[PDB]
Design an enzyme around this catalytic site. Sequence first.
Site, PDB file in Angstrom:
ATOM      1  N   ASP A  34      47.443 -11.251 -33.002  1.00  0.00           N
ATOM      2  CA  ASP A  34      47.813 -10.073 -33.798  1.00  0.00           C
ATOM      3  C   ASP A  34      46.665  -9.076 -33.927  1.00  0.00           C
ATOM      4  O   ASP A  34      45.522  -9.365 -33.594  1.00  0.00           O
ATOM      5  CB  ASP A  34      48.339 -10.453 -35.205  1.00  0.00           C
ATOM      6  CG  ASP A  34      47.456 -11.463 -35.969  1.00  0.00           C
ATOM      7  OD1 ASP A  34      46.801 -12.353 -35.370  1.00  0.00           O
ATOM      8  OD2 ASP A  34      47.461 -11.378 -37.212  1.00  0.00           O
ATOM      9  N   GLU A  72      47.014 -14.293 -37.861  1.00  0.00           N
ATOM     10  CA  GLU A  72      45.737 -14.667 -38.442  1.00  0.00           C
ATOM     11  C   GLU A  72      45.387 -13.734 -39.600  1.00  0.00           C
ATOM     12  O   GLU A  72      44.793 -14.155 -40.592  1.00  0.00           O
ATOM     13  CB  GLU A  72      44.643 -14.668 -37.348  1.00  0.00           C
ATOM     14  CG  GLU A  72      43.211 -15.065 -37.808  1.00  0.00           C
ATOM     15  CD  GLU A  72      42.341 -13.873 -38.300  1.00  0.00           C
ATOM     16  OE1 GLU A  72      42.745 -12.690 -38.126  1.00  0.00           O
ATOM     17  OE2 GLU A  72      41.237 -14.126 -38.860  1.00  0.00           O
TER      18      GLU A  72
END
EC number: 3.5.99.8
Lengths: 397, 398, 207
Positions: free
Chosen positions: B82, B136
């Site tokens: 991400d 994350e």
Amino acid sequence: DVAKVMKTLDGMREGLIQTAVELGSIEAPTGREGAAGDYVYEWMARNGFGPERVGVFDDRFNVVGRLRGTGGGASLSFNSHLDTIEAWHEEGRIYGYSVVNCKGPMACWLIAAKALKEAGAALKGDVVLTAVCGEIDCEPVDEFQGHDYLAEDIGARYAISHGAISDYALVAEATNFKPAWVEAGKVFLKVTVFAGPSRYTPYVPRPVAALDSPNAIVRMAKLVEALEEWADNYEKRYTREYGGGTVVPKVAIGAIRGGVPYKIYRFPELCSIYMDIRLNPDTNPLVVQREVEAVVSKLGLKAEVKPFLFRRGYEAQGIEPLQNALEVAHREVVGRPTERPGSPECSMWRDTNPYNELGIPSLTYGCGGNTYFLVDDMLKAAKVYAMTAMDLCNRTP
Amino acid sequence: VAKVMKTLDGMREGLIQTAVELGSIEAPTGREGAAGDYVYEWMARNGFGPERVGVFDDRFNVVGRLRGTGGGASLSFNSHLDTIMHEAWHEEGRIYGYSVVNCKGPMACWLIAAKALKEAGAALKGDVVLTAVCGEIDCEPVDEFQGHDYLAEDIGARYAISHGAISDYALVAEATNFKPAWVEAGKVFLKVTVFAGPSRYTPYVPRPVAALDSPNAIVRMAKLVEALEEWADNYEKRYTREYGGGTVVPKVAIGAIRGGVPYKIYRFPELCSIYMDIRLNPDTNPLVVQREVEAVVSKLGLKAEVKPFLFRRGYEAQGIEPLQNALEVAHREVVGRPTERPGSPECSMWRDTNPYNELGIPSLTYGCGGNTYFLVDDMLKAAKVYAMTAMDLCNRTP
Amino acid sequence: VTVFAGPSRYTPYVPRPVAALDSPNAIVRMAKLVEALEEWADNYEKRYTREYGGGTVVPKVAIGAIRGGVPYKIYRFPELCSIYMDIRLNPDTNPLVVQREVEAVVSKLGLKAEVKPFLFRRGYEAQGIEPLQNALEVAHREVVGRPTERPGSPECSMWRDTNPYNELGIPSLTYGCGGNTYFLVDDMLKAAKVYAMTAMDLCNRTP
């Protein structure tokens, strides 16, 4: 006051029975717990506990509410799980495996919270009410992914992680008034034995010895036998005593598949088994993987040994204040001191693991345990829970 | 080693391509699927046997392996798919893109280090576990914001590890400028709702009233914000704490506020909410912090609900020494100096070392870079360090 | 009203200590501006109180909503924060006069802000209301038996659908029974009697 809360609880036998029977009647196997969750949410809401649906899916969620205290005290969580694997009242018994596991113990602490709130019990600390989904040991693997197959990852751990935190936590389960505060962890292994070459049935070579068969199903017979023997000794070797219980970690082969049934005219080059291996809190899953890999090498087989699940077990640390409050309450209501649990109830999964993993000392305790609950035993558990909270939530942290 | 080193020199171009292609794929938390697919297909072309490991069909982690000969420690390399939400391109021996800095750049480095290890035929007794994870970044669901679109860390690294991506040790690649850390902070998020009222239609609002006594919760909240800033100033000092793996300075911030709704303002609100990000050193109970904030509220004679909506523990790695050592030795050879220690912010934040350390896998974080670009020379070095670290550690016995 | 601040940082990088008017977090500056605007509001209503034939207008102010950041992304504090103000006007105040005033509160704190109107409606005093006032007063005296009392200032400092009627040249007043949990049916029959008479009077006068 203890005296008041007891009598209040005695006047709620009927709410207790109704709550259990209504909850126990809702169909809620792992994967489909929404309806039970909706019930408990609406129960908590009518009773003023300000519930929240806390979930990763809108039809598989945990329900978290609170009885807020006046300030400064220690907070205690009560916890039970909404999933299962009709329920009815008869002569002081409630029947239903859905009640034993686990709507019965849930009613007990729901009613105990109701009693505390209405009797106006003076609690400096918060009581946290946590009903969770996905407690049972279903897990995704291979083509089985997402929503329908998930469980522990979206249950209690998810709930605690998303705000359902406290200083101590009691997990209510059918323990027959025996407390535990160690549980096993687990590693699941997919073990795929390689063979081949595959042939159309009229071309199959025979005779060949089982360890040398081109059919991986046939080699797998030999490897299953070796792994069973390995399992007989695994549990002896890794048995281990803790303050919170004795862990006897067991192994079982939960599934096998090789080939596809609708195409059987050519036997398979691969065969897979799926192993449930429990771990004491002090065993690295990789130590166990090498062991299985060694059973494989010692047969002169080639195999893929692939982990698809790892969870740690924990022994509670600093459990004494909760242990003490519980033991004291137990002695008054049940009238005996607590007996110690058998090793299977300490060598399991329980939602004490996530609580302890996150630094919230946690033990498991409740009435019952296999076909039914005595309502008397349930009123007793609810009395114990209510006292435990009145003690512990007024101690300073 | 010298062979793996030159194999890597001959992959400068693949390293640059891999980074640019990855950094060009749009992938904020919630929409990481496409990046995941790139990496799945990348790992498949290179023979690393990928698997999609996710709770959602479009938000998944990707796990593969370079299998060893038997008898060695296994090492995981980890980076996250991400991003926050720029674009990515190669220029003068630089790669530009904030998605390259965080975190496709460090990722390419160890994808390439694994490619180099495999092609040079390096002898490794242990497995290398290749783990690219989603979610994350510290987005979390709260209130009406639930499920798929708002989830992150619960479906990321922890999910992948729990579902089989385990090893003896784990290196998390991030932009740390070749400084390793192995402590991170945890966190507790608090929704603090201040009570006031009664609400009246505007022509009926009583005035004048002192701010702490105002029937409007937005106005009481002005005071509480001032107090919580004061508390926040001292909180970080009081809970600063030194570890072997780094110094943790846990900070506090008010990340969001809302009270009333903008489309119905003719009745002032009886409630107003703020959302606080409070970092924790590994040794602080989130409730101690909750009580501190509740106490600020009481000291003002206000009534409020202080509701936690996120708790994660921080960890210091335990038994990190074999990885710390393999890394240090590799670093000194490739970079030529000893490693410097990281600053306290990079030890006082979230990194996916926490889930590894929580699950008994000692883990530190290390990589090149650190804002706008990476030097390709610095990347090739990191890939070299990773390759060397695996070559040492994956041949030690476990 | 949107107050500007920044730069925004990831939480482990937040600079402290900094004084509230200087905070990189616009939520924190906004605490100071809210306080100033409340004081401004205490005096706004006194300064713009104004008596009319149709009632006394006491125009009030209230901060109806605030939002800054998004709750599902709180790891980086916001550079913007917005509040939404309900400011009533007597019929004789230009909304722009009020906007500059709020802009001035902002400048006096040494803050920078966007002050953006998103609603303007005019209030009105009815013009030529006397025939309706008279017909009503006469009907009122017969049915209720007393002469009419005058309303409090909040019921003259509100929105009512008299505004659109008066804006369009139809003299309009507001009147009915009741006022908070219930109505007396007797009071309702009385109001209905008043309305019926008012119409029988007024609708037979020539215009």
